[PDB]
């Protein structure tokens, strides 16, 4: 490929192990998960601390108005459930239907009593790419597995956009936020263009995303030129090669615990 993002990927792939570890978190915001990991290792159920690094990323978007979760939420590819627990804790959300393939080899939902947990219907063993869409007010999808080969990552990003098209066809007025793993690949730009033309939206980079991923989130609630957004992010990731900062350490998000009714 002949984009700045492809140059970034080639530089990332040619790093030595020491270069990679020195690069991946430079200037990156990172939640302190020492205590959360200790609770999860013990299998504590009564915890409101995030079950994954995903919760703070969705929170970062919600707190800024780049998404506003309400009504019936669907979480496609929920993994441990960090986005599902975040959504369940929002007073405006009435229910969460969370789907993930799970089992051995993939992350299974972590069963905790984080605030609103009882409003989540977790379904593991589910392939969301072959599942029929249903009613939703908000569609979330955090799917996109990293891979050294940007061709694979582009195909995975494209499949997620196609999945979002199917859910938005079912729910034309639903809000939608989804991960775009490799937004610089031309078939991905093309799919995002087609999505944005019909449904609106734009891309945003959360500060928790490491320099070792080009992931950006598409939200229908924001706007902005896709090509410029992607190239600006590529240039920033290229600039961070040789950045001498460490991570910017912040507390992990704590949603509190407890049920909620209606």
Ligand X SMILES: Nc1ncnc2c1ncn2[C@@H]1O[C@H](CSCC[C@H](N)C(=O)O)[C@@H](O)[C@H]1O
Cα 193 versus chain centre, distance:
20
Minimum separation from the CB atom of position 244 to ligand X (A): 30
Q: Between helices 54-63 and 82-89, what is the axis angle to 10°?
A: 40
Contact 171, 139 (CB under 8 A): yes
CB 46 within 8 A of CB 112: yes
User: Binding to ligand X by residue 73, rule CB under 6 A?
Assistant: no
Question: Which one among 3, 100, 157, 196 touches ligand X, defined by CB under 6 A?
Answer: 100
| CB 109 within 8 Å of CB 124 | yes
CB of 10 to ligand X, least distance (A): 26
Closer residue to ligand X, CB minimum distance, 4 or 49: 49
Q: Nearest to residue 152, comparing CAs of 7, 4, 9, 8?
A: 9
Contacts with ligand X by CB under 6 A: the residue count is 21
Exactly one of 35, 37, 64, 106 binds ligand X (CB under 6 A); that residue is 106
Q: Which of 8, 28, 47, 52 binds ligand X (CB under 6 A)?
A: 52
Cβ proximity to ligand X: between 85 and 234 the closer is 85
Question: Residue 258 Cβ, how far from ligand X at the closest point, in Å?
Answer: 20
* Minimal distance, residue 109 CB to ligand X, in Å: 9
Give me the DSSP letters along 5-36: HHHHHHHHHT--HHHHHHHHTTT-EEEE-HHH
Q: Do the Cβ atoms of 117 and 88 come closer than 8 Å?
A: yes
127-146 residues near ligand X, rule: CB under 6 A: 127-129, 142-143
Is position 126 an interface residue for ligand X (rule: CB under 6 A)?
yes
Residues forming contacts to ligand X in the complex (CB under 6 A) are 52, 54-55, 77-83, 99-101, 106-107, 126-129, 142-143
């Amino acid at each position: 490929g002949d984009t700045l993002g492809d140059m970034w990927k080639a530089r990332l792939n040619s790093c030595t192990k020491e270069e990679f570890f020195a690069y991946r978190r430079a200037g990156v915001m990172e939640t302190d998960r020492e205590k959360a990991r200790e609770l999860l290792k013990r299998g504590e159920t009564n915890m409101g601390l995030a079950v994954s690094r995903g919760t703070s990323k969705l929170a970062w978007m919600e707190e800024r108005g780049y998404v506003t979760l309400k009504g019936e939420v669907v979480d496609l590819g929920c993994g441990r459930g960090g986005w599902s627990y975040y959504a369940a804790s929002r007073p405006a959300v009435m229910s969460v239907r969370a789907y993930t393939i799970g089992g051995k080899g993939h992350e299974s939902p972590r069963m905790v009593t984080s605030l609103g947990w009882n409003l989540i219907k977790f379904r593991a063993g589910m392939d969301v790419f072959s599942m029929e869409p249903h009613r939703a007010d908000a569609i979330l999808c955090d799917i996109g597995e990293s891979n050294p080969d940007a061709v694979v990552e582009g195909e995975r990003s494209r499949r997620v956009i196609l999945l979002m098209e199917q859910w938005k066809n079912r729910n034309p007025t639903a809000t939608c936020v989804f991960k775009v793993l490799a937004p610089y690949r031309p078939e991905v730009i093309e799919a995002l263009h087609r999505f944005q033309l019909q449904w609106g939206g734009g891309l945003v980079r959360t500060p928790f995303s490491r320099n070792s991923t080009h992931e950006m989130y598409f939200s229908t609630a924001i706007t902005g030129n896709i090509v410029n957004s992607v190239n600006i992010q590529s240039r920033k990731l290229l600039a961070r090669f040789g950045d001498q900062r460490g991570p910017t350490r912040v507390p992990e998000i704590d949603l509190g615990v407890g049920t909620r009714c209606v």
